[PDB]
Design a protein around this ligand. Structure first.
Ligand SMILES: O=C(O)CCC(=O)C(=O)O
Ligand SMILES: [Fe+2]
Length: 386
């Protein structure tokens, strides 16, 4: 902590214009097919989004219950890092310690609660339910851990905590709803140039002597108030600061319209030697399912084992025009997966022949090469009914 955060919080120089303000109603799948979720969005009203949030007088304490006290939570010491020593019990008591009495500066930005009752209490925007790689790609009988359980998040921050510049794991995109309080964001776009600066910055030790926002040409500091829903696209480098005690509900997802950046970031994580602890769980296994789903949804030719096919069929019994976004995306998924050394192709377990799959994708990618953008804008993803 060499640079003055206060300065970075009050100078009016991060005036870039990256964020697009819109109405939740306008946020549908045709929008994603049209823009490819390349812009960070802010919805002042939750109207049209299809989200559901607890009675707003909900408090951290109300959270220490639903999840479960004595339920170890990863808590970071915004003055250095880690200290996940505590559970909700110790934490809740910390949240309510008047600022001055407050000894440490703690932040909880990892509580993933889909396990707890809190789940059916919180609901993400329906558009995100349409493109989420998990709900839509991973075999459903495996989520009814052997499935990426990194979907719903509950961040709880105190006045003063600051999360330094980073790009969310796996190049995931993220949605946040400020339930109580507010947050200040510094946004930097995944410009090839910026993404280089950022990687070199993580190698030099992410010094903390340099404010990354000052290293780039254009940065936008945004302010999220109570009630806003925030969407950050895959790849963006951002830093966050909690001006006051805030409670946020959100999540990190993967979709099929910005696959190249998603892989772009995984490879940064690979070169930056990020510990396998903080890696998106089952990244490549997921990728294999994405392809198998595409081939099956477009071609009706399944590539899962008979067993898996049976479950998918049981559960149920209870041409096509792609955007360039997906065509270029599938291309990367194919090339990426092929450049993986044999022992580490992480072929999921529900897949018969990966080669037959890969062969079928390459053929699929050439037959569909000429897709009409207009005709592609179907308003609904081709991969549906997980
Ligand atoms: O609010 C914060 O401190 C960090 C938010 C977060 O989870 C992220 O930017 O990845
Ligand atoms: Fe983030």
């Amino acid at each position: 902590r060499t640079f003055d955060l206060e300065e970075k919080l009050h100078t009016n120089k991060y005036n870039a214009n990256f964020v697009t303000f819109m109405e939740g109603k306008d946020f549908n799948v045709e929008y994603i097919q049209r823009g490819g979720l390349r812009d960070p969005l802010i919805f002042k009203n939750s109207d049209g989004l299809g989200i559901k949030m607890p009675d707003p007088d909900f408090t951290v304490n109300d959270v220490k219950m639903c999840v479960g006290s004595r339920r170890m939570v990863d808590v970071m010491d915004v003055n250095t890092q880690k200290g996940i020593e505590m559970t909700m019990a110790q934490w809740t008591r910390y949240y309510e310690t008047p600022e001055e009495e407050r000894e440490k500066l703690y932040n909880v930005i990892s509580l993933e609660f889909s396990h707890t009752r809190l789940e059916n209490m919180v609901q993400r925007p329906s558009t995100v339910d349409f493109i989420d790689w998990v709900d839509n790609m991973w075999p459903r009988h495996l989520k009814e851990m052997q499935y990426p359980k990194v979907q719903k998040y509950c961040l709880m921050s105190v006045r003063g905590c600051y999360t330094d510049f980073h790009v969310d794991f796996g190049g995931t995109s993220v949605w946040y709803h400020i339930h109580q309080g507010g947050k200040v964001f510094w946004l930097i776009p995944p410009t090839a140039h910026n993404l280089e600066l950022y990687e070199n910055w993580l190698l030099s030790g992410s010094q903390g002597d340099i404010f990354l926002g000052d290293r780039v040409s254009d940065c936008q500091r945004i302010e999220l108030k109570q009630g806003y829903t925030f969407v950050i696209p895959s790849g963006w480098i951002h830093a966050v600061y909690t001006p006051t005690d805030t409670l946020v509900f959100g999540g990190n997802f993967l979709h099929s319209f910005n696959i190249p950046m998603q892989l772009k970031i995984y490879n940064i994580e690979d070169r930056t030697r990020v510990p396998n602890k903080f890696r998106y769980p089952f990244y490549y296994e997921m990728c294999w399912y994405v392809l198998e789903r595409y081939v099956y949804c477009i071609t009706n030719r399944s590539h899962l084992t008979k067993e898996f096919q049976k479950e998918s069929l049981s559960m149920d019994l209870e041409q096509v025009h792609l955007t360039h976004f997906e065509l270029e995306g599938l291309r990367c998924l194919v090339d990426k997966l092929e450049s993986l050394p044999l022992h580490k192709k992480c072929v999921p377990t529900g897949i018969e022949d990966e080669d037959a799959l890969i062969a079928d994708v390459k053929i699929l990618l050439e037959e569909l090469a000429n897709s009409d953008p207009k005709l592609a804008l179907t308003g609904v993803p081709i991969v549906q009914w997980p």
